[PDB]
């Protein structure tokens with residue numbers, strides 16, 4: 426048996442959204458954003474269990490929307506994404522799960538096929554993430570000039586990301602803060618598998634991102 | 647001082663879609679992809695004229711789907727985006743527009759808001775583009791080994807991109823090849839106004855993009 430557990434990150438504050446309420450708890454088509462990806466995991470046969478990571482003040486709001494035997498616990502997040510990840514790893518330690526899938530709840534439109542593909546792709550290498558080839562010109566702003574960044578081999582890292590539990594754990598053993606989990610895992614000399622995603626995997630990050638999420642949400646269920 | 651013309655670029659081959667039909671002419675909800683941005687320009691009061699740049703053998707396909715006076719013409723593109731843009735500039739010499747707005751037809755879901763907002767903001771420096779702040783971890787591949795790009799100040803550059811006519815002309819007049827038109831214009835020492843857009847401005851570039859195009863099309 427090789428238990429696969431999914432970690433749903435929903436402890437962030439969504440400061441860049443400029444709303445009262447963290448983005449993951451905004452309603453679209455009558456459900457909170459975090460519910461969309463949650464039920465992809467609950468309907469997914471590749472997923473043996475789920476951990477939802479949120480801030481202490483959101484535990485009840487979550488508890489009252491989630492009744493499913495696959496949910497192993499609601500777990501207190503940290504002040505950062507990486508700390509929220511670590512908090513989940515400590516909770517999962519008692520279960521000794523073989524593989525772990527991590528996903529930003531703010532990417533709500535997660536497909537079944539992506540979950541299973543990233544997990545089997547993590548079986549072979551130890552580490553994998555959904556990703557997307559760049560399709561735009563890319564730039565950096567330096568003191569009122571824009572640098573045009575070279576584009577060959579550039580990819581947006583999405584989530585889900587999936588790892589053998591021991592690898593991801595080993596990578597967080599000494600703390601650290603990163604945007605994602607492939608970065609710390611790679612520091613161990615582990616190759617990161619890229620798995621073709623699509624633009625539905627975008628992260629609701631800014632106020633403008635809501636128009637699009639409502640549009641997909643209308644079609645979803 | 648005024649006329650604004652949108653240059654709608656539709657002369658690409660879309661070779662990364664791995665179709666046999668360029669993505670601009672793919673049928674979504676009974677309409678070809680170029681029809682969508684086209685109608686935004688047509689329905690838009692900020693736009694006095696439209697030039698459509700396409701490949702010679704697709705001319706009649708484009709003509710057939712033109713139902714409006716506002717379309718000034720159909721120009722034959724070139725083998726690169728830059729060359730296709732230059733093709734249109736030449737055609738427009740006779741129209742003497744004040745500002746030109748250039749837009750990738752493979753970015754189908756353009757809004758009114760952006761067409762006018764991009765043009766307003768092009769007036770201050772003579773150059774502006776729709777842009778989108780990065781919101782993903784970003785990486786570069788280097789032979790079965792990836793590298794993490796620093797994210798500070800990183801934007802995805804979109805279209806529409808609008809310029810004063812004269813300036814764009816000056817940026818292209820010695821030829822050249824670039825992914826967009828802000829880069830050559832900046833080389834002339836012009837500051838580029840970034841205009842905040844949204845993810846609906848994505849460009850249908852890969853096969854995996856079509857589903858999302860279909861979802862949004864159902865709502866137009």
Ligand SMILES: Nc1ccn([C@@H]2O[C@H](COP(=O)(O)OP(=O)(O)OP(=O)(O)O)[C@@H](O)[C@H]2O)c(=O)n1
Pocket residue numbers: 434435436437438439440441442447449478502503504505506507509528529530531532628629630
């Ligand atoms: N302490 C944190 C911070 C981040 N996240 C999660 O990490 C994911 C991706 O991060 P991001 O989009 O940046 O979320 P926020 O931190 O909430 O957004 P912002 O930077 O605008 O505050 C989100 O699902 C978010 O809830 C988390 O679980 N715990």
Ligand SMILES: Nc1ccn([C@@H]2O[C@H](COP(=O)(O)OP(=O)(O)OP(=O)(O)O)[C@@H](O)[C@H]2O)c(=O)n1
Pocket residue numbers: 655656657658659660661662663668670699723724725726727728730749750751752753849850851
């Ligand atoms: N010779 C060319 C090539 C590009 N474009 C236009 O530039 C826009 C954006 O470029 P891109 O996505 O790269 O289009 P393609 O070149 O067709 O795609 P590919 O790189 O796969 O061939 C498209 O709307 C395309 O029609 C153009 O008009 N003339």
Ligand SMILES: [Mg+2]
Pocket residue numbers: 437
């Ligand atoms: Mg954040």
Ligand SMILES: [Mg+2]
Pocket residue numbers: 658
């Ligand atoms: Mg191209």
